[PDB]
Symmetry: C2
Subunit: 46 residues, 2 copies
């Protein structure tokens, strides 16, 4: 590409909406697995 070339992405807003949705649900799955560690640890901590 000579010098800097401008390029345009297809459906950037729709892709951002689904990107946020996947990230948020994955973050929930992280929390729902940390609590299971807490429930398992208190059994072996107390």
């Amino acid at each position: 590409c000579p010098n800097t070339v401008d390029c345009f992405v297809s459906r950037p807003t729709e892709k951002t909406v689904f990107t946020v949705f996947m990230i948020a649900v994955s973050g929930i799955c992280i929390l729902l697995n940390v609590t299971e560690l807490c429930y398992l640890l208190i059994r072996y901590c107390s």
Copy 2:
């Protein structure tokens, strides 16, 4: 034009050759005119 755009000139070498010809002759014409002024400005003054 977006960012910087590359453009290409038509016949750059041939135009350079004719540019050198015209500049050189104009420079010679300047000297031929200066000497005539020098000759006319040593007799009268």
